[PDB]
Design an enzyme around this catalytic site. Sequence first.
Site, PDB file in Angstrom:
ATOM      1  N   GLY B  29      16.109 -15.265  85.481  1.00 12.74           N
ATOM      2  CA  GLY B  29      14.671 -15.364  85.304  1.00 12.74           C
ATOM      3  C   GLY B  29      14.214 -16.725  84.830  1.00 12.74           C
ATOM      4  CD  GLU B  30      10.502 -20.277  86.519  1.00 12.93           C
ATOM      5  OE1 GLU B  30      10.340 -21.284  85.799  1.00 12.93           O
ATOM      6  OE2 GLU B  30       9.809 -20.043  87.533  1.00 12.93           O
ATOM      7  N   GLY B  31      12.101 -18.477  81.646  1.00 13.66           N
ATOM      8  CA  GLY B  31      11.695 -18.184  80.283  1.00 13.66           C
ATOM      9  C   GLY B  31      11.562 -19.444  79.462  1.00 13.66           C
ATOM     10  N   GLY B  32      10.573 -19.444  78.571  1.00 10.09           N
ATOM     11  CA  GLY B  32      10.296 -20.639  77.790  1.00 10.09           C
ATOM     12  C   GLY B  32      10.161 -21.846  78.690  1.00 10.09           C
ATOM     13  CG  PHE B  33       9.709 -24.980  77.040  1.00 10.36           C
ATOM     14  CD1 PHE B  33      10.146 -24.363  75.880  1.00 10.36           C
ATOM     15  CD2 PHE B  33       8.358 -25.223  77.193  1.00 10.36           C
ATOM     16  CE1 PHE B  33       9.260 -24.016  74.892  1.00 10.36           C
ATOM     17  CE2 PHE B  33       7.462 -24.899  76.192  1.00 10.36           C
ATOM     18  CZ  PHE B  33       7.917 -24.297  75.035  1.00 10.36           C
ATOM     19  CG  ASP B 144       5.432 -12.956  74.087  1.00  6.80           C
ATOM     20  OD1 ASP B 144       4.493 -12.140  74.244  1.00  6.80           O
ATOM     21  OD2 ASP B 144       5.977 -13.548  75.043  1.00  6.80           O
ATOM     22  CG  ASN B 149      10.273 -10.789  74.718  1.00  4.26           C
ATOM     23  OD1 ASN B 149      11.172 -11.434  75.258  1.00  4.26           O
ATOM     24  ND2 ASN B 149       9.074 -11.303  74.461  1.00  4.26           N
TER      25      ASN B 149
END
Lengths: 276, 274
Positions: B29-33, B144, B149
């Site tokens: 996946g794509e998370g934070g930076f 968050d 999460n």
Amino acid sequence: RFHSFSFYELKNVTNNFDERPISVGGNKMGEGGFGVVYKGYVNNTTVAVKKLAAITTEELKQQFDQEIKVMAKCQHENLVELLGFSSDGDDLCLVYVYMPNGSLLDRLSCLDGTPPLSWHMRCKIAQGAANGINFLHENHHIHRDIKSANILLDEAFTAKISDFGVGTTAYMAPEALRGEITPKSDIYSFGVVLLEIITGLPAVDEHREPQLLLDIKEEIEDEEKTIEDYIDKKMNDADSTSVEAMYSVASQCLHEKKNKRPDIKKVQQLLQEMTA
Amino acid sequence: FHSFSFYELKNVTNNFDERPISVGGNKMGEGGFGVVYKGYVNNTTVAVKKLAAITTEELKQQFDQEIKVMAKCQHENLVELLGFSSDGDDLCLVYVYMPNGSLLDRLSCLDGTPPLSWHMRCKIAQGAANGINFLHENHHIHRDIKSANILLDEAFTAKISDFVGTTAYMAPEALRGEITPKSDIYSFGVVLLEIITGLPAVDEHREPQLLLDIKEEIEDEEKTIEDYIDKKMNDADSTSVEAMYSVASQCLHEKKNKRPDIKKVQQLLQEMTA
Ligand SMILES: Cc1ccc(C(=O)Nc2ccc(CN3CCN(C)CC3)c(C(F)(F)F)c2)cc1C#Cc1cnc2cccnn12
Ligand SMILES: Cc1ccc(C(=O)Nc2ccc(CN3CCN(C)CC3)c(C(F)(F)F)c2)cc1C#Cc1cnc2cccnn12
Ligand SMILES: [Co+2]
Ligand SMILES: [Co+2]
Ligand SMILES: [Co+2]
Ligand SMILES: [Co+2]
């Protein structure tokens, strides 16, 4: 043909028509259609027993004989079976062979935590319901209420078309909403059913946009959406090709104009080529 | 913790194959930076976040801050940070892989997994609450809190993770810029509504679009909580469902000081289990 049951056997076998729900251990599984329906066990078979209650006690009878009359003609692998009846003392009773996996509706919604139906199984159920409808049509019957709640499933998950007591508006073709009585309306409702199979969504949801599942056709045609966006996420075995094939069949079934819809043999053929 | 060489995590992630896992790639996946990849090393299946470009040294500061907070956050109900890699470029964080994914995916029965029972859902709620309580005792605000999460291991043990806020989960004061743990409580109330209903927190095509608005409908008695219960359970009795709904309702109180704190929520879920 039919086994003639005595009212007193049916009473004993339903535990004196226990009204408590089966979830509690009683025999009452349903109500409506001028009768209550109870789980029972007779002639080495689990059965569904509809005991008719009392408006005009003669129109009850009328309906009783009509059902037997139609059910005598309709016997197919993909139709529910009437085992027998009782014209005996007290009440009228109708006995059907019990389908333990319930309606296609309940399984598509995974009611009571049943595991989701796989795509393979969904395809076979669509083929089977198509075959039962085809039997109904070849012998000049109009179902007039095709919906996922009228498709039962047996031990092996084979589709059994049923009719529980002018139709259901979320499944109704435009011409049927205007009073026309035709098998093409059945094909339209079956197209809605195929949308349910693909999406896992109910036909009508008042709190959803669109409220009617059939309207997603529009959203896909106007290219505001695609079929992939509506695919039920609760399958891991669904390939794009055959999903689009079933969607094509459903779309053809959902043509507003009844003479542009395929007949049930055409549907059968397309659903065949879907898994071929 | 373990210091990894960057080329090690490069080897173990198939050179950070960005194709999704369903295609046979490594991208989770794509998370934070950064992007999160699946890998395997040292008898451990791992999730590797590789951070990418934003000022570069503030990237390093976030990297260091995550290592500093997670270094002393070791709990049964939090994600476990295994190690990292800082040699040259890039920066990588390595966590222990959670094979049952997130609570969001399991509530939506993604890919045909069976639905979680009511009992399992209750234990997951309790575990997530324990993780939040750990965070709050150590003077951390999550900021968050959402079903995406809350990860799950082989035994379906809840593990809180993080990768500002999600508007469908945000308390009113959090939307106005306040930073308080009471906001975490509000978001947890949303998560509890999800657990009860199986419904996602926001649905653009649904009325209402925000799951939190069902509270209003229930309080305005246009509806009941039984109308909303997930159909995909056979073991949910009305008593404990109403109990968890009560807890979720208290968590969803608009006035931040009128919400229970995390320990009260733990007590309430406890009493719900009996
Ligand atoms: C109680 C009950 C009453 C009636 C019928 C029934 O389906 N009758 C039926 C009547 C007519 C027709 C054909 N016509 C339709 C009208 N049309 C105007 C003409 C053609 C067909 C059809 F199957 F062929 F479709 C069926 C089924 C049951 C059942 C049951 C049952 C068995 N297992 C379970 C498990 C759970 C719940 N139920 N259940
Ligand atoms: C790659 C990765 C990177 C980071 C984190 C992560 O959660 N880091 C985290 C950083 C900080 C904090 C503390 N808070 C302090 C206050 N601060 C304001 C917010 C932050 C916490 C917290 F857990 F404590 F919450 C966690 C998890 C993963 C994962 C993973 C993983 C493993 N298996 C799977 C399977 C499916 C999906 N993911 N996944
Ligand atoms: Co409403
Ligand atoms: Co090493
Ligand atoms: Co229990
Ligand atoms: Co839209």
